[PDB]
């Protein structure tokens, strides 16, 4: 990380051009250049690169991912003084506290709303249950009722939570990580309603963020579900739109998760004082937030003075009405594996690969298996690649891999060499495409520990090669891709065989 400049990461749906303008005023006053980037999957890239001491000086994401970053030592503790803290709403500071310390600056409070086309639908439905009949009527007109992103569980969560779904249960001042709430009748009733919309062709299982946005902004669908960042593109489209309360389900409000967009400082940054100056005295001002909000609306900002200025906006009032019906996301380190598992479940149910009951029933053990597997496989691949070593079951599993997995690479080196060579892994897309090789390992229908350890061993073999060709940052996404194949498609087998304890036992001697 280069001293004397700031590199900032923020998601590509936010006002990153507005943020760069704030950076240009910082540069004017200080001479320090501010580079704003919006990499793909930044919420996964950050912990990967920051763990090796690289990455941006400042990272923007909703607060839910920041507890895991903090737990892994990737965030600097921030040091705003009491007078600065008093300028932002207390509940926003609460979202960025982890183990008693403030680990990010809160920026703005986000929640999804119902966005509707007033020309197609001046009187939008109050209930989810009305949407099938409405869609049938609109189809007879060449339109559709509703399109929204079905690929990210954030957007279906309001419906899943409406009748009883929850992430982790909060009691006695803390979340019980052993009590996930998607395997219950309310969560299942909500996901069933969604899958039934798909089955009855009122929605398409493939609809993603870009497709839904294009449909609404071209006037083809009467409704979408999105957050404040989307309003700018709808402004550009000239669609006559309103922002309102989400439909009810079984008479109960939809419960969107509330996210606090937050900015953390990389623990490895040599620029922490510059980062603090930028965030406290340039971004978190009326003029700073205005520049970002003018690019893509932020929602209800954390800064009291500017929140009061904007609060008259009916779209923001609707955002906060939806937010009051939902819950603040947890920020515990399990959230990343939780989202992994719920994303798989919704996509499997929506596509019919699983029933709704099976999909949600799998989620809790899927998240635990993913978190544990990801840690083991990523540690092994990275230590193999670097030559240096950097919880009992995971320790024994890594000791097993150092013997058995190194052993596979010894005994089968000639095949492994010509395997990775014919594949000709030159860039980041080539590495992503290795997930197809991984699926082929199991394509004949057979699963066993030899195949599983061999795939991991080949992953380590490839990871060593990646470092030699200056693609060392691709090791963690390789590890994640192996983990995904195993957990997404072999969960049942891993459970039957007692997971990583069974792995250690199988390869003992």
């Amino acid at each position: 990380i280069e001293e004397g400049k700031l590199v900032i990461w923020i998601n590509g749906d936010k006002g990153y051009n507005g943020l760069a303008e704030v950076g240009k005023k910082f540069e004017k006053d200080t001479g320090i250049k501010v580079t704003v980037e919006h990499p793909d999957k930044l919420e996964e890239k950050f912990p990967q690169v920051a763990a090796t001491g690289d990455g941006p000086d400042i990272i923007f994401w909703a607060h839910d991912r920041f507890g895991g970053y903090a737990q892994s030592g990737l965030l600097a503790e921030i040091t705003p003084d009491k007078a600065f803290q008093d300028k932002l709403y207390p509940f926003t500071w609460d979202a960025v506290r982890y183990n008693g310390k403030l680990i990010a600056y809160p920026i703005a409070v986000e929640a999804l709303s119902l966005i509707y086309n007033k020309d197609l639908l001046p009187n939008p439905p109050k209930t989810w249950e009305e949407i099938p009949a409405l869609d049938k009527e609109l189809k007879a007109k060449g339109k559709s009722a509703l399109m929204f992103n079905l690929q990210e569980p954030y957007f279906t969560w309001p419906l899943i939570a409406a009748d009883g779904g929850y992430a982790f249960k909060y009691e006695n001042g803390k979340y019980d990580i052993k009590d996930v709430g998607v395997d219950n009748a309310g969560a299942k009733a909500g996901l069933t309603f969604l899958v039934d919309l798909i089955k009855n062709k009122h929605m398409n299982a493939d609809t993603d963020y870009s497709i839904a946005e294009a449909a609404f902004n071209k006037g083809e669908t009467a409704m979408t579900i999105n957050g404040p960042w989307a309003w700018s593109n709808i402004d550009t489209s000239k669609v006559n739109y309103g922002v309102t309360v989400l439909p009810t389900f079984k008479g109960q409000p939809s419960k969107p998760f509330v996210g606090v967009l937050s900015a953390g400082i990389n623990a490895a940054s040599p620029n922490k004082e510059l980062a603090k100056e930028f965030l406290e005295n340039y971004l978190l001002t009326d003029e700073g937030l205005e520049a970002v909000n003018k690019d893509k609306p932020l929602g209800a900002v954390a800064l009291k003075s500017y929140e009061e200025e904007l609060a008259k906006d009916p779209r923001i009032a609707a955002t906060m009405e939806n937010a009051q019906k939902g819950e603040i996301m947890p920020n515990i380190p399990q959230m990343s594996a939780f989202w992994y598992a719920v994303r798989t479940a919704v996509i499997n149910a929506a596509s019919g690969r699983q029933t709704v009951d099976e999909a949600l029933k799998d989620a809790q053990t899927g998240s635990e298996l993913y978190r544990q597997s990801l840690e083991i496989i990523s540690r092994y691949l990275r230590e193999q690649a670097t030559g240096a070593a950097d919880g009992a079951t995971s320790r024994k599993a890594l000791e097993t891999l150092r013997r058995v997995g190194d052993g596979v690479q010894r005994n089968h080196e000639t095949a492994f060499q010509g395997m990775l060579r014919k594949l000709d892994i030159k860039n980041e897309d080539d590495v992503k495409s290795l997930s197809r090789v991984m699926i082929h390992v199991f394509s004949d229908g057979v699963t066993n520990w030899g195949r599983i350890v061999t795939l991991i061993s080949f992953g380590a073999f490839v990871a060593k090669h990646l470092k030699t060709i200056n693609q060392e940052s691709c090791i963690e996404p390789l590890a994640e891709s192996i983990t995904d194949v195993l957990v997404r498609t072999k969960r049942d087998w891993l459970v039957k065989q007692r997971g990583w304890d069974g792995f250690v036992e199988f390869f003992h001697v």
């Binding site: 596979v408 014919k422 082929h440 390992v441 057979v446 061999t454």
Partner: peptide
Amino acid sequence: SSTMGQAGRQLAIIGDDINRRY
């Protein structure tokens, strides 16, 4: 593509060799 399938099937064959060993 054919190459990725051939590589995946070779890993499976090696994996069965390893499975038999242990």
